Amino acid sequence: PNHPLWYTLCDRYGLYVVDEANIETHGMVPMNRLTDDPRWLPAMSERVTRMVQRDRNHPSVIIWSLGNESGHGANHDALYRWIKSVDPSRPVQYEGGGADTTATDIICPMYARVDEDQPFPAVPKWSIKKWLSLPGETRPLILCEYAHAMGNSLGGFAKYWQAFRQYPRLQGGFVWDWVDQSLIKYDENGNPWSAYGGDFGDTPNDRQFCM
Amino acid sequence: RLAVMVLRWSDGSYLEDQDMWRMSGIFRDVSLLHKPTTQISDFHVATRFNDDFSRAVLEAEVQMCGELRDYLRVTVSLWQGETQVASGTAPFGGEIIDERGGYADRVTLRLNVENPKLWSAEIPNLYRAVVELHTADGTLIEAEACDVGFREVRIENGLLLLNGKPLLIRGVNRHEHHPLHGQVMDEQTMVQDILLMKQNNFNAVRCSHY
Ligand SMILES: [Mg+2]
Ligand code: NA
Ligand code: NA
Secondary structure: OOOOOHHHHHHHHOOEEEEOOOOOOOOOOOOOOOOOOHHHHHHHHHHHHHHHHHOOOOOOEEEEEEEOOOOOOHHHHHHHHHHHHHHHOOOOOOOOOOOOOOOOOOEEEEEEOOOOOOOOOOOOOOHHHHHHOOOOOOEEEEEEEEOOOOOOOOHHHHHHHHHHHHHOOOEEEEEEEOOOOOOOOOOOOOOOOEEOOOOOOOOOOOOOHHO | OOOOOOOOOOOHHHHOOOOOOOOOOOOOOOOOOOOOOOOOEEEEEEEOOOOOOEEEEEEEEEEEEEEOOOOOEEEEEEEOOEEEEEEEEEOOOOOOOOOOOOOOOEEEEEEEEEEEEEEOOOOOOEEEEEEEEOOOOOOOOEEEEEEEEEEOOEEEEEEEOOOOEEOOOEEEEEEEEEOHHHHHHOOOHHHHHHHHHOOOOOOEEOOOOO
């Protein structure tokens, strides 16, 4: 959840908002170790329920998200249904556990390609055109993350937009991401420079992957 | 002496506008068939399966015309080469279907078949079903027969399945055409076509358009 003023500004200037619970357990092995554990359900529930209680009156918020990169656990299913019960006015989405689980109203993959399949075990990233028509699948597809804009990037961006325009159920996506997470440091002359992972003696780190 | 007057054009021509040579005549086989007065007038063969296709039921519905009597029976026997794998005998008189009763001139035979050899384009396993119309005391009136292929075709969850597996149709449309004989088909030409089709990795044909 963002600073409260953000939603007011989105209401007034006009932007659609996905409001996302503060739950990410990416570093767990496997990713759902905590989110499938009922002992962590109370802690997770508060991050979802208190978000909805705070932000539910904002017209800019059109979709609720259960968080990010936390695999798919039974706690997600429970909280998906809680939201659907208290606020039928907004779809609920969640990418974890393969982007098309029972905890999401929208197929919402991250970095699924336009034409090329990436058949990872358990959590494949299908071609987005292919994904829509998998046997029994009916949901819309909106990428929660695509076109990773790291450094000299966005090659093939036009391929996504051609597909979005051609396929009714491909309804767009969210570019990753808006702004480089670089920090300012100062040299011996006091002159500022842009710093990334490792530049503060932080270790382990992931270097320029924050930009 | 037979006399046959064949018209090139008829009201039927309005339903025969296929993209092909427009020809006419007696262009398929002519035959003479003798049937007994009491006869098999229709029969349908169905094969249903359990979940893993390890058990099947062959259901044969048989209809008669002519002299309906209590001594009448139908025997359906199922053969795998020279081996009889299943057989059933019953008198006529189907189940009650409405307020007026049932079909006294019909019978449905149900044969259990364990571990049936399944039919596909890949392995065209066939059985022979013989349908015998006979008196209970053993007089064959007449017999009809067909090749039986144990297979299920169904669409499930958006997929066309054959024996539970999704097909990939390597198909071709085929008109009945011969450069010398026109629309007359012969066994040799049909076999030549089928051999060439299979040799070129086709597994399916559409009867375009008849
Ligand atoms: Mg035509
Ligand atoms: Na679209
Ligand atoms: Na990053």
